[PDB]
Design a protein around this ligand. Structure first.
Ligand SMILES: *C(=O)/C=C/c1ccc(O)cc1
Length: 125
């Protein structure tokens, strides 16, 4: 059985072997992006943090329309560096504040096993 948590050293392996219901049962927000930042998957925990339905944001561009506050060197910039290098794996604190009460979070971005895909994990702090 899986026992993955925010920050698990092998998180991308566990999540590669999970289905959507399992993604929605995680305690942390979990978003999958393509290399351009378009949203492929968006779990229930993340939608609860951001007060909306995951189905409404699938297909949108994370950095452009959903989370413009993350369009910054420290987040979008680091994302693109990790996409390019094939080694995305970075953790930092951030404040989410577009169309929502400003909320402090810890973020962990990590390359997915599935091709052209990248995870963004989020938890409250
Ligand atoms: C800043 O604009 C961040 C917004 C945000 C972050 C993460 C989400 O899932 C949704 C919006």
């Amino acid at each position: 059985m899986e026992h993955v948590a925010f920050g698990s050293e092998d998180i991308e392996n566990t999540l590669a072997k999970m289905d959507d219901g399992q993604l929605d049962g995680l305690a942390f927000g979990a978003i999958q992006l393509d290399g351009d930042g378009n949203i492929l998957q968006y779990n229930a925990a993340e939608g609860d943090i951001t007060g909306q339905d995951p189905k409404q944001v699938i297909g949108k561009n994370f950095f452009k329309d959903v989370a413009p506050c993350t369009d910054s060197p420290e987040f979008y910039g680091k994302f693109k560096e990790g996409v390019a290098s094939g080694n995305l794996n970075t953790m930092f604190e951030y404040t989410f504040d577009y169309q929502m009460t400003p909320t402090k979070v810890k973020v962990h971005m990590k390359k997915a096993l599935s091709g052209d895909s990248y995870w963004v994990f989020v938890k409250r702090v």
